Amino acid sequence: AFAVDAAKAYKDYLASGGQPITNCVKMLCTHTGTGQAITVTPEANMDQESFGGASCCLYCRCHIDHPNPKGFCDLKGKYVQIPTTCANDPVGFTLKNTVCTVCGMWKGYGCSCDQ
Amino acid sequence: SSQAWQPGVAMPNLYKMQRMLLEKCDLQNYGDSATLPKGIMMNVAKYTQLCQYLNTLTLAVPYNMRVIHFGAGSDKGVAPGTAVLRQWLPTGTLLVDSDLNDFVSDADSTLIGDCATVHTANKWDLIISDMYDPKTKNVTKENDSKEGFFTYICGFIQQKLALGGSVAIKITEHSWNADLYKLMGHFAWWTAFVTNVNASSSEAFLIGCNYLGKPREQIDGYVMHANYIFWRNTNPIQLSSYSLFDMSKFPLKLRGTAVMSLKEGQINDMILSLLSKGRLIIRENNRVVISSDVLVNNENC
Ligand SMILES: CSC[C@H]1O[C@@H](n2cnc3c(N)ncnc32)[C@H](O)[C@@H]1O
Ligand SMILES: [Zn+2]
Ligand SMILES: [Zn+2]
């Protein structure tokens, strides 16, 4: 009953003061987009950066299997929007946060479905 | 000039018509660096300007478009150029990329290995190559036409580029091939494009626009590369990242260009005219199927 828990590893690594994963691929864009979290094309608004999805996925970047049971990746081949205040660590951001299944914004970073 | 607000500079037609001798490339703003927008990698900026320039040509853009991208890896293990290509290309475009070394990609499918191992059943609407071996930047050796992956690319274009399709193949002073230049004569139009963010380098993208599958002009590849270097040697290009700040018109317009399957005999002058205008793609519309040849070796004593 053993699989490696890379998500926990990275979180503990960050908490100890580890340098976040670099070389996430930031895109040029207008920054006038919808601001939803994971999109088929860059959608940053004025308070986000847009990144190549694969380069921001912990599993992709670590060459490890995806926790999805069919191995599918949520980010690869799409673009993830990251709050500019978190753009220093896009992998950490996508790991630690969650997309609202209703409006497609990051819970706590655009999702206003609790009003 | 006004060049600084463009994404780059294309080889003026007058230089293409010369008959120069190959000289060493000595760039005036050698060593200069463009100031990149905060946090943007050189290869994102370089591919964006390449794509901004391609927007000005007459590319065929069919439904079910297929694009193959060689040399897509980086020493960072990611694929910045693939990410820009997928941003640029219409949503749903089939994007395959490849490199000698492993990398993680946003492409629909990635093949790792030497490009000569790569085979595809289907034809392609656009071929992009950033393949480059830095050991060619040897200023102490004669500068001869190179083979290697350039030999692969020439055969790949002739065998698997759809009529009406286009290519952009990165070259440098030392990384070039005479037959590739000659093959540019098989497109309705061609140029060598230098991006403004990398204008201090002898890099350019050899662009062939709308493939005709036959000589439209006869081009001597050794002379043409000498013409290109002569252009670079006498036309300093001001480093510029101005065009990176205007992304409003960046995505490639899905033109829904027509695709027909046709046999050799059916290609009349009317067809060739439409191919030349970016109004027609000739290939099968079958499944995209790719593979990579793997050499098997048993190292056990
Ligand atoms: C973007 S830097 C140039 C890239 O081209 C790749 N490359 C160079 N020569 C070949 C080749 N023969 N086949 C595949 N990729 C190549 C290198 O591995 C590097 O990632
Ligand atoms: Zn992934
Ligand atoms: Zn919501």
Author numbering:
A (entry chain B): 4271 to 4385
B (entry chain A): 6799 to 7099
From the article:
Non-structural protein 10 (nsp10) and non-structural protein 16 (nsp16) are part of the RNA synthesis complex, which is crucial for the replication of severe acute respiratory syndrome coronavirus 2 (SARS-CoV-2). Nsp16 exhibits 2’-*O*-methyltransferase activity during viral messenger RNA capping and is active in a heterodimeric complex with enzymatically inactive nsp10. It belongs to the class I methyltransferases and contains a Rossmann-fold, typical for methyltransferases, to bind SAM as the methyl donor and ^m7^GpppN-RNA (Cap0-RNA) as the methyl acceptor. The large active site of nsp16 can be divided into two main parts, the SAM and the Cap0 site ([Fig fig1]) which previously have been termed the low-affinity binding site (LBS) and high-affinity binding site (HBS), respectively.
To understand whether the binding of SAM can be imitated by two individual smaller fragments, we sequentially soaked MTA and glycine, resulting in ligand electron density for both compounds. In this structure, the orientation and interactions of MTA with the active site residues are identical to the structure of MTA alone ([Fig fig3]). Glycine binds to the methionyl cavity which is occupied by an ethylene glycol in the structure with MTA alone. The potential interactions of the bound glycine with the protein are the same as the glycine corresponding part of the methionyl moiety of SAM. Hence the presence of glycine in the active site is most likely, showing that SAM binding can be imitated by the fragments MTA and glycine.
